[PDB]
Structures are given as structure tokens and as C-alpha cells.
Symmetry: D2
Subunit: 468 residues, 4 copies
């Protein structure tokens, strides 16, 4: 038995708030989860088409994963990274040999506890390998929240600052940590479009976003630029690049002698209907970062994978880095089980096929709803651009440069979410004009149908315009 009234009391009183003021806050108790559902203490079932934070890839509370964790708990315990375990070694082997066995780039893995820690590690390694300070990121990128990872996060609304309650006159950024001269922000891949929706290219066929990135690196000196960090689909920032963007970035970093880090924390492990997001583009990175679907959130884990060449350099030195929980044997047992289930049950193909189905459903919704400007994605990771049906332009002018100071009653994705909730479906987004949709890789056709029906309903309400 649980006193949920007491839980709510303690949650209100003793926990720090995020995104909501204490004034406006209402706790949202979840007593248990299963598959694509969250279950409230009263038994209310919610179909979660956020997949929490696009991170419960295998499905909620997988029985084989949970059984694997229980077995680990018969032996461990805790040992730190200086000590070797079967679970930690096997996890690395599964990634390099089993998942990426068809590719030549992978060298060595370091496990840590979170995706932000993975990005911190990737940044440190890239800089040490090149012996150079600068890293290039893009407008709207999200790469985590800790001090180093945040420097490459250029998503205004997710930088751990403070904003006001329904007033945008009160932005307070973290003093001493609100900009960083060791990072250059390049344009979003989506920045250079003409009035007809056509892509701008230079006379050599290079996308203008890539050409501008090249020029920034030339100006600062390629000799001081360690790496370009990307997301193949911006996750929190909610965007899909032109197809040619990632291949051209791979080519340009090669030409300039700069590393390419692709952040796979969100796109990794089947999320996009391939093992990794980069694999849609016929290229290979120098470093990837991992989290979320690495363990499908069963326990906290993150990881960095570096190329053979980078691993060979690191192997020649003593690296003076310690993280207490890095390599935690029970977390690694969860990772092994998660990856074994994904492989054995062909979760990646399930994702590919289900994305193809989602594409079909969104096509039909776009024909019925003029507030849908476009949609794109793959696997279980979709964006839907929301516009005013009458003007065909976004409702929120600041768009991906908005802050959470905004009243949610002015925000289309918040209006959509609140309405879809009436049908027992959690669906919406994190940007104001852009849906961000994701479920478990093994989500059923019936649950996709139920989600799309709730979205159908929310879009009817949005287009009625009676919220205004």
C-alpha cells in the first residue's frame, strides 16, 4: 500500500521544480508502467507518444530486462571502472562486434551514467586527440545540460536558466555559464530555404548551411577546431535536415581535418528505424555519444564510442579521468539485456516498418488538417510542423527561439497536448510550432491508430480557434 496523498505532499514540498513554478504546479503521479502505457494510482491508463523523453525504446518494464537486472543483483554490488566485469565487457562487445560489426570505424567504448556525461566525455576526447580547443555546434542543437555539454547546446529554452510565469520579460541565464568562446554556433541545417521551400546551394552544389559552417572554421582556423558536433535529426530542437546535410558535413570535416561527433543519445538504438541515426546517410562518424535507448531507460547508462584511430591514440597515454558510477555492473547488465532483446526480436525492423505506417497516417491527417504544414521523420521519431490554417505561417513567431516564459495557452503544441489528453493519449511536442512524436520501437498498430485519432481530434479543436 501507498498513501498517494502523502506522496503528492512530499513531491510538492521537498522536490525542486522544473518547467513549472511552485504556484502553477500540480504533481502527476505515475504508479507503474507497461509497454507504451503509464498507469496512474487510480488506474487511469495513458498512452505515451513521447516515450517519456524518446528514451524507452524497448518498451516500458520489459520482463527480460528486469529479469537480467535481478540476476545481476545476485552477484553485485558495485565495482568502479578500474575493475573488469562480464557485463561491462559484453556491453562494449555487443555494440562494436554485434551491432556495428559491418562497419570499420568503431574502436573502443567508455561507459558513463548519462547522455550528458557521454557528451562531456566525447568533447574531452575530441579536444585531447586533436589538441585543439574549438567545437562547432548548430543553432537549436541539444546535447545535454551539464557544464561542458551545455556549451554546445544552443536551444534557448533548454539551457537551465530561469524564466517567468506567463511573462517573457524575465529571462535569467546562469551567470558565468551563458556563452562559451570555445564553441562556435553554426546555422541550423534548415536556415537556407527560399520563399518556395527550395534549398539554397552554392555554385559547387554545397548546401549553404554547410558552406557557411566551412567558412566559420576557415575564419577561426581549422588548426584550432577539434570537431563539429551534430544531431542527424535535432531532437529537442525538433528538426529534420535536408538529406544532403550530413553527407556534406562528413565530407567537409574530412577535407578540413576536423573530427565529426554525431550525438546519437536520442537517435540511437533503433529510434530512427536503423541501429543509428547516422546510418541513413551512408557515412561514418569519428565519435558517437549514447544514452536513452542504450538501456531503454531501464537503468542510468550513457556511453561514448570512438574510432580505431582515436582509441589507438588514447591507448598510448594514461588518462586521468574517473567517474564513480561509470561502468556500474548492474547498469551494464541492463544494457546487455536491452541490446540482446532488441537484436533477437528485430526491434530495428519493427521501428522501420512502424515508421512507414506512421508516415501513411500523417499523410492522411495532413490532407484533413490545414494546420499541418509538413511532417518528416523515420522509425519512431517524427516532427509535424504546425501552422495557422488561414495564414499558413507558424502561430509563435520566435519559433525555436521561444522561451518557457510564454503562456502555454498561446502555444499550439500545448493546446494539442491538453486536448489529446481527453482521449487518454500523451502527444505533443517541446517546441511551440512543432510536434515531436515517439513511442516504443515495438508499439502496436492499434496504439498508433489510437494516438493518431487523438491527434486528429486535437487538430479539429486547434483549427476551430476557440482557444484564442
Amino acid at each position: 500500500k501507498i498513501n498517494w496523498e502523502q506522496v503528492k505532499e512530499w513531491d510538492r514540498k521537498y522536490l525542486m521544480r522544473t518547467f513549472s513554478t511552485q504556484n502553477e504546479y500540480q504533481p502527476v503521479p505515475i504508479e507503474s508502467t507497461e509497454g507504451d502505457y503509464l498507469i496512474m494510482p487510480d488506474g487511469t491508463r495513458l498512452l505515451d507518444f513521447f516515450n517519456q523523453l524518446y528514451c524507452v525504446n524497448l518498451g516500458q518494464k520489459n520482463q527480460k530486462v528486469n529479469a537480467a537486472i535481478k540476476e545481476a543483483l545476485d552477484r553485485y554490488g558495485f565495482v568502479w571502472d578500474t575493475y573488469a566485469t562480464d557485463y561491462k565487457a559484453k556491453a562494449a562487445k555487443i555494440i562494436i562486434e554485434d551491432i556495428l560489426g559491418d562497419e570499420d570505424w568503431p574502436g573502443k567504448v567508455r561507459f558513463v551514467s548519462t547522455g550528458s556525461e557521454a557528451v562531456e566525455t566525447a568533447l574531452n576526447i575530441a579536444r585531447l586527440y586533436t589538441n585543439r580547443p574549438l567545437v562547432v555546434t548548430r543553432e537549436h542543437d541539444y546535447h545535454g545540460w551539464t557544464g561542458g555539454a551545455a556549451t554546445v547546446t544552443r536551444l534557448r529554452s533548454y539551457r537551465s536558466g530561469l524564466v517567468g510565469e506567463n511573462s517573457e520579460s524575465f529571462s535569467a541565464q546562469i551567470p558565468g555559464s551563458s556563452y562559451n568562446s570555445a564553441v562556435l554556433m553554426a546555422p541550423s541545417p534548415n536556415m537556407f530555404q527560399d520563399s518556395d521551400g527550395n534549398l539554397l546551394k552554392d555554385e559547387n552544389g554545397e548546401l549553404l548551411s554547410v558552406k557557411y559552417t566551412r567558412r566559420m572554421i576557415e575564419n577561426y582556423g581549422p588548426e584550432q577546431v577539434a570537431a563539429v558536433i551534430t544531431e542527424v535529426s535535432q531532437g529537442a530542437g525538433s528538426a529534420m535536415p535536408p538529406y544532403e546535410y550530413i553527407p556534406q558535413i562528413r565530407k567537409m570535416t574530412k577535407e578540413l581535418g576536423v573530427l565529426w561527433i554525431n550525438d546519437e543519445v536520442l537517435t540511437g538504438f533503433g529510434r530512427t528505424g536503423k541501429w543509428f541515426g547516422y546510418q541513413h546517410y551512408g557515412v561514418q562518424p569519428d565519435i558517437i555519444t549514447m544514452g536513452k535507448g542504450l538501456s531503454s531507460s531501464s537503468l542510468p547508462a550513457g556511453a561514448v564510442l570512438v574510432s580505431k584511430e582515436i582509441a589507438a591514440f588514447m591507448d598510448k597515454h594514461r588518462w586521468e579521468s574517473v567517474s564513480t558510477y561509470a561502468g556500474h555492473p548492474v547498469a551494464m547488465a541492463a544494457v546487455c539485456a536491452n541490446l540482446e532483446v532488441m537484436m533477437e526480436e528485430n526491434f530495428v525492423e519493427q521501428a522501420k516498418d512502424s515508421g512507414e505506417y506512421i508516415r501513411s497516417k500523417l499523410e492522411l491527417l495532413q490532407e484533413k488538417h490545414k494546420s499541418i504544414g509538413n511532417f518528416d521523420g523515420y522509425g519512431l521519431l517524427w516532427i509535424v510542423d504546425i501552422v495557422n490554417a488561414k495564414t499558413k505561417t507558424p502561430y509563435v513567431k520566435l519559433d525555436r527561439n521561444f522561451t518557457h516564459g510564454m503562456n502555454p495557452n498561446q502555444i499550439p503544441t500545448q493546446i494539442i497536448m491538453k486536448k489529446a489528453l481527453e482521449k487518454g493519449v500523451l502527444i505533443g511536442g517541446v517546441m511551440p510550432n512543432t510536434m515531436r512524436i515517439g513511442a516504443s520501437l515495438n508499439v502496436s498498430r492499434g496504439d498508433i491508430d489510437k494516438a493518431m485519432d487523438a491527434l486528429d481530434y486535437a487538430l479539429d479543436y486547434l483549427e476551430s480557434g476557440e482557444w484564442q
Copy 2:
């Protein structure tokens, strides 16, 4: 089942060699140390070798290895979860916060609100962010030899040269490579270590008004840079990795100085927290209360990854008035919180703090005896299950390694006293030694037995015989 061999450890060793990034060792020198299972204060190797761990890993398995009540509690949580992120409420997350604030610190008035994260470094990142936002000021003051974590923000306040995630050579001190760009935008002042400013008679120096010179100089730095731009002073009451104990008055004087200057005091309890020092928290030895503490390690006794920051009522009331745009995927992970809950409940119910206090007194008496027969023990200090032992050359009474806490791991371990001691102790099936070259750093579980303490001290005895013989050099 028909299986008689669940794990092929030869295969594990090859994978570990081939596929895992090294730390502290080059690939060429690396000798893997596989651990198949743990229990209490013991690690068990796949060949059955049992090692008594007087490092308690990283001074972080406070409850003991593989506590059966904690592991059962984790298994129970797995009937229900699953994963929800911090926007959702769970019983385990809310109860964890309540145990800290109401139960453990119910006698204190400063505590306000907790944010849970996954590691001690993430806790420190969070504390720094909050201190800077609350004060609207950028600078944080740390101390020489402090260790506060490894991630970009936490590392800015880490001034322990050998633990800043840089690269050093294999038995050569000539190839230091620090991470390029890592101090761009750092907003940090390094104040003196507490143990700076000693006289030849070993006493810590004070001014005419009795202010320690370490504190007086910290005050001068804050005045010089402008108190109006200094958010916080961050401390460890006992430097963990840095391996130092401050004079008794240092922590009280830092509380006084920060109050007088209008600056916050963050005490980093990631290592000293949860009974490590024979009180619930390290700061409680000093009769003062901080504005913010950071936690990890003993928070879950390493059962699952957890960290936390606890802020004062004043700070929590401020943060409550704003929308805080900060997200961490695993922050508040319900299964991790179930582990914290169980760890803390066992700790409370079985009086682990008093067990630590009592065993510390017993350790003190064993070290007294060791100092009487070993001139290589210059001095020792500590409390609960956290001890430093200053090692010196018995004939000169001066440390062997000149750079001391400013050493790097570029050094050959065959020249390092704490490495010599460790290597010899292992012959007795005991892991004991330290992080710094001239200083032992000793810890075990809070419920460690008297027999296990005796076993470890006998091993140290044997190791010191060998150091003092000078056969190693």
C-alpha cells in the same frame, strides 16, 4: 540447468582489453582485475581470490557490498517500473526527499528542497547552477586540491592536478596534455588549501584576531574580485581525493566569512556524506550549517547511480518562483530512488552512523599502535570510516615524493609510497593504500567488522616493514 559455466572469463578479459577505453593505465601496461561478485567488505575474483577492500571502492559503498535488503527493494521496484522522467511524480522519489529532509536532517532548520540527479558530478553541476542563479553572480571560490567531479562545470572547481581528465605519459612526467579549451569561460577562483600556512612545529597559522591565514586570504580574494560578483565558496570538510583534514576552526570560519560577505557556502558531501565520517554528514562535526550540499556515493551506497543537491529553504523559495528550464533524462529515476530509499532506511534502522563512529575510534587506536612501531607514519587523522595517514621517509621525516599533492600519474608507481604499500598489502589479500603519493586514504563499509579492521591493519603493518626496509628503491 545443464550449464556449469555461465561466464567465460578468458573471453571477458579479451573483450575488456580490446573494446574498453583505458583510464590511469596505457593499453601496453594494462593488467585487468576482474571481479565476479561482491559481499560486505569483500570482492571475489573469478578464480575465487577474495580481497578485503579498504578503499570501499571509491569510499562509496557505505552500507556494504550487495546488501540484501537494498537488493530486495530494487527487485520490488522492478515489479512496477519502468521509467518516468522528473515531470512525473513517484512514491520512491518523493519519499527519498522526505527521508533526507524530515528524517535524517529533522533536527536542522536550513534544509529546503532536493533535486535528484544520477551522479555526484551532476549534483555539483546542479549546485553551481543554483548558487549562481540564486545570487545572480558568476564567481565560485574553490580550494587548492579540492576534488568536486569531472564533468565540465564540476571540473572548473576541481583543483587536483592529477584528476582533471588530462593525459600523462607512461613513467615520464614530461608529457602533460590538459584538455584544450576546458577553462574558456571558467568563473572560478582557487583559494588556498586549509592546510596551507603551517609552522615548523606543525600548527596552522592565524592572524592577531585568530582568523586562520587560509581563511583570511580567501576573504582577501573575495574582496579583491568583489563580493558582489562571488556566488559561493565550495568546500569539502575533509578533502577526499586530495587526502587532507582541515584544522577544526577552518569550516566554522568559512561559514562565518561567507555569512559576513553575503556569499553562499556549498559543502560538497559526495564523499563525506551518509555516515562516512561517523555523523550523518561531514559538516555536522563543525556546528555550522551550509546553504547547499551535494550528494552521491553513500546516497545509494553505489547500489544504483544516484546523486542529489539539497538547497536551503531560502534558495528553494526563490527557485520556486521561476520556471527552471533544466532537464536530465535519468534525474529521479524511480528504480534508483527505490535503492536510495532502501539504503537510507537500512542505514537509519541499523544505526550505521553510530557503527561508523565506534569503528573509527577503534581504527584510531590501531593507528596509534602502528605509529609507535613505524617511523614512516608521520601522523594520521580522520573519523568514522575515512582516514588519512601521512607517509614519510623514516630517516629524514620528509615525504618521498616532492611534488606531493601536485604530482601527476606520469610518475612511475615504483617510486610512489602509497603504491608500494598497496602492492605489498595485496600479498595479504587486502586492498589498502591511497590516491596521493605520500598519503594513505583508508575506508571501508560503515558496518565493517573488528576482525576485518584487524586484518587490514596487520596488512598495513607488513607493508610498512617493507617500505621502511627501502628494498623497493
Copy 3:
């Protein structure tokens, strides 16, 4: 009776080689170029060789070399001074500020107060300090290829790769070194140059709303970083060292964008100031008024070292309410201020600004004729005595040096078209060329004669003949 000036010029050259630090040249490639005296647009060597200077040194001797009225005025001030620092008042310092505000800019309401310093870089340092203090915000936005000076603060906003006080190799672009540590703490964003987004015809790209793409992305960057932490955008209306002219619409769009975002606009007039462009200031071509300008060069026409910053009435009123703890020894130097006063008085009385406009129109007609005869001229643009000429391969109409304004001085000058032009024109006793590899940057005194313009254009004619006669390749 005749007191001959005792100068051994071979000894001077020896001393210059041995005792003075080199810039732009290695010691081994360096040959000193002694100049004994100057007059009007001419440099005179010790042997009496005369050189017509169509660089006007650094586009900075606006009034002409060794103007008798200015020099008499300096000699007069030396009857009285001496030196006093800025806490003391003099007639010369107060008059210089009055001339700028009430006699030059009396037709505009923005000007408030001046601070005099000794150099253009010092003026930019001061402007950055004031913009940040007034707004209480850290970030300043500059543009790719801007040059704003060389001192630590001014260099942060200089994004001209080849002019940031680093080291490059001798005819090798593989060994170089930027100054370590110089960008720790820098609070600067680099926005696109005004010329960055062009089409095949040469038109600058605009969005459907009519906003230049360069401006659009500048605004996006400010939005992303938070307009609440952006103090200012700093610009040059014509990139001086960077050698570029904006589309007419850029500056009005920047003025509008800054007003809309609540950000200051600093226009750097150190090069374009004081008649250089055929108006008093470069910004005056664009129908707008800035919040702050920086001055140097033509401020005194290099007669003595002076720089200045002029801030708006609203900025001045804010600064006036506080005690500003800033001192510079030579700021307001009374004899340098005497030079400024006389330079400006001569410029006004003899209508040099009007003379410069007229001569620019003349130069325009001369360049038109050169372009019709020389296919190596792709385009040219300018005003007054500041001209850019885009140099291209005559057959392709595209530039020879691909890195263009991102080149370094590591390049061999026998590969740089502007170096080739300079070397050839020298045979005709004319100094003319550029700072960037594909772009001429032409300037003389505001009172340059038609005969000297004709002589310079003749030498260029000769130079371009040789460039497009495939012999240098």
C-alpha cells in the same frame, strides 16, 4: 653657422635591423625602408627619392603629410605644455570635443560626450567598456572580416584572420600560432559579413520580407543567445583592412534591427572618419545615427597619437550619474589635443570633406576608364578617398587566391595579385596596392591633387597590363 643634422642612415638601418621587432616580415627577408621626411602625398627617402603614397600610410594622414598649419599649432602648444592628465582641464581638450559635437555633428541630435584616448584600439576598448556598462550586458556582436584594432578587447571583435597578432611562417601555410589564452572569457559573437550571401550576378540575398539574409541571421543569433545579454553590435560601414563595401541597405537594416532588439549600435569610424569617404563620417552615407562611434587616424591625421569615443546623450547621462574608475595616462594629452583641434579646424576652414567628395567622383571616372581597358578589374566601389578594386583573373572573372579574406600572411607574396600590382607600380615611384590578396584598397590625402591621382592611376594602368600579361605565373 650651418648646423647639419647628423644622420648616418646606414647606421640607422643597422640599428633598425638589430634592435627593433619585426612585423609582417621575418628578420631574414626584411629590408628597411628609410623615410627621412614627408610632404603632402609624398614620402622622401634620405637620398631624396620621392614616393607618391596611395596608401596614405594606413588611410590615416587625411589632412596631408606635414601640414604647416597643424605643425605650427603643435609648436604653439609646446610654449605652454607640458603634460596634464585627464583629471585636469585644458582649452585644447575641451575645444576638440566642442568641435566634434557642435561644429562637425551639430546637424545631428545623438551626440552626447567624448572621451579622448591615444589610439583607435584604445577608442574601441573604451566603447566596448561603455556599451557593456550602460546595458549591463556582456555579449558584443561583430562580423566576419571586421578589423577593430589589436589590443585584447578590440581584438576579440576583430575577425580578420590575418590581422590578429599571431605568427605565421615564411612562405609556408603550415606553421603558425594564434596567441594562446587570448579568447578565454571573450564575450563575442561573429555574425555574417554584409557581403556573405551573394548570387551569380552579384546581388545580395534578401528574404521574402526584404530583410538581408546577413541581417536575418545576425538577428537570429542575438535571439538565440538572448537579446537581454547582448550589449551591442559593432560594425564598420566599409570594412577597412577587410576591404569591402556593403549593399546600401545593410546599415539601415542594422540600425533598425538593433533598435527593435534593444541593443546598442557602435559604428567604428577609426578608418572611415573625418572626410575619408567624402562626408564627415562613413555612417552619414546611410541616413542613420549610431549610439557610439570610435575614432582615430583622421581624428588628428596622424600628426600626433589620438583616438576618441563619442557616446549618445542617453549613454552620457547614464555615465554621468556614476564615478567611473578608469584612467589612461595619455588620455587627453594636451599637445595631442592641440593637434586634433588644428587638424579639425583646417579640415573645416579649407573644406577638405567637400574636396574629398569631388576627388572621389574624379577617381570614379578614372577607375571606370581602367575597368573598360582592364578585364582584371572585376568591380570597384568606394567614395571620397577610400576605394576598393576587386582584382580577378581576366579570362574567368574570378579571384586568384581562393581563401580570399580568410588568407594568412604565410602565403608567398609572389602569388598575391595585390602584391604583384604594388611591386610593379613602385617602378613608377607610386605606392599602391592592398591589404587583402584579391582586393586593392586605395587612399590618399583628402586634398590630393588631380595630377597625383593621374600619376597613381597611370602606375596602376602599367601594373594591370603586367598582371594580365601571363608572365608572373
Copy 4:
């Protein structure tokens, strides 16, 4: 005919204020100068025992210097640093061959226009030569005001910030420029003494301030520290180090492989009764910076002098640095004439002898005035430590960490200055509890007597409490 009332009106209206609010500001017009005197429009003569900013070493309006400037103006004009002149080359030769002819360290000079610019250049060269970023400065050092030079200025009251009018209700440091991680602040010399004034030395005889500086460099890594920058007597910061401090810094930097930059902008050119301040200490630096006495403020000039080995390194590269007015030939003619006069008329020995006389005068004042706690100095550069006689402690607690937000009616050096002005003498200090006395190197015994008499009168007043 000059209209000085109109001058005062223009000065108030059109010039930015420093140290004073507009509201409290009273302009102080100076019509001419001569020797150690400033002359007001009404003929009032003021004996200047600040020597402006300790920078008019030769005396005001030296006729030989002014004649030399006039001669240069018959030839120039302006050429920038790429061209050679007799004046620029001769100035460098005078410094290296004539003044420093007895020393082996000097290599090459770069002339610039100000002391701050000299410091900027020195920092750049030290960092390029070593290929290292960090520079160590000391608490209370003043090394100039420009962005780079200001990073090593750790004098709280002189960092180009804003403070209030007789209040603490408004205070503001420059955003983005109020600290710098590429600089480490080491302790001031005399860091801590024991209660009897004994210097704290370790078992190797190393002073505490030096030992701690060494520890900082070890902690940050000597491989990343370019230089230690010092003033042998802190000028604005108003302090004299123990004799052994500078020698031990020279020794320590050599042992650690770190450069020593000694900032001679204020102590240079006879100020201390030697050609350079460092010459009191039997050591040679790697780099010095120069200004002030370099031209005795006749025209703006600064300079950096680097060692033979540093010069040999820079000579191998193309250095992409331009400063328009660096090497200005008329400024260089002034430097030449200034240094020639100093040499020919033995101004350095004049300074030394007058320093000895000043010492005897201050000894007599201390016998008579218990508000004089101590005094020290050399040549024409002195400090006098002022204390409340009845408590034996300084009146202003914050001491060298004060700000100009204080009311000047509470500041001992302000009270002294105001009373001394009744005798037509300008004398006082920069810091609240410390006199900073300087005059021209050729100041007469009669003027020293007049200044000391005015100080005696001022100290009677201070000790009377009547100001309080």
C-alpha cells in the same frame, strides 16, 4: 586670448567624467606647466608632488625636449612601423646600447603609444614565445586598463568599473570583463607577516608569497604558464616588497621554466634612483614594459623590450600585428631627446640623491607624527603608511581593496591632499591609507622642503581630528 569660463563649460558638457559624478564635478583648469609646477589661468602656481601620474620624470615642459619635437615637425609627418626612421632606430639603440649597455639580457624593442599597449604587447609575446596561455599577476598590481592589460590588473578600484557617489547602493563591474581564467592572481608580497612583522620563510628560505606563487604554478601545470608579471614597487597599489621577493621570483621562474615580465611603466627611467626598478635587485627579467618616463609624458609613447632569445624566436616568423601609431616618428624624437637629457645631465643620480634627502625629511616627519606608521621607497617614488595614531591601525579597513564609492571626507589621503593644497602643494595618494609621493627627477631641495612642510601641516590636521 583664452576664455577659461567657456573652457570650463565645454569641459563639463562635452567630456566624459572619470572618478567624479557630473553632479559633484568641479573642473580644474591648468593653463601651462614648468618644472614641478602647474599654472592655473589666474596665475596660481601648484607644486605637483604627484608628478601627474608619476610620469613627468624629466620635469614639465623641458625646453630641450620641446626643441627636439619642433625639429622633428620640420621633417614629419607620419610613417607607420613598416618604414624606418632615424628617431625610432635611435630610441631603441639608446635603450639597449647606452642605458642597458652593461647587461646581456636585452634583445629588441617594439614601440607603441601607451603603457597599456606595452603590457598588451608583452603578454602577447610571452604567450607566443612559450606557446602557453596562463599569466600570473599579484593582488593589487596595476598593469593598465585595456582589455588584455586589465586582466592582470588586480587593483579593485582601478578596473574601469562604475561606483556610486558616497555610497554602495550602485556598483557595477564591466560585464564580460570582470575576471579572466587566463590569469592567476598570486598573493601580494608581504602576504602575511607574523605579529612582530617577521617574514614567513620556509626551510629553503623561500618567502611565503613566493612559495605560494610556486604552488599555484605547480597546481595549474608549469607547462601551461607563460609568465609571471610584477611591479617591483606596486605603483597605484602603493606597496614595497621585502628586498628578497624579486630575487626569489627571478629564481623561481627560472626553475619552473616560466618567463618573468617586469612592468617598468611607472618604475622606469630614473623613477627609483636607478635606470630601472629591477636594477635594485641584482637580477634581469625576460621582458620589460615601458611608458610614462619613457618620454616623460612629452608625447604619447610606450615600449616593450624582450630578451635576446625571445627576439631571436620572433625574428623567425611573420608577426601579423599592426598598431597605427606604433613608432610614430615625432613621438620617437621626443623619446630620443628625453633619454639624451637624462643621460647627459645624470638625472638618475639626481633622483637617487633627492631620494636620500626625502628619506631624511620623512624620518623627521615620522618623529613628529604618530599618524606615520612607516615609510619606504627610493628616488622619487615613496610610500607613507598612514595610521590612526590612537588605534595604531589604518582608518579605512578595506585598505587596498577599497572602492571610490567611499566618501572622500573619510579617506586619510584625501584629507591630507585637501589640507596640503592650502599651501599650494599637491600631495597625497591613490590608496586610502597610503601616501604615494613623486616629483620630477630634477626637483629642487627648496621644492622638496615646501612639499614636506605642506605634509607636516596636513598631518597636524589629520592628527587633530578636526576633519572628523
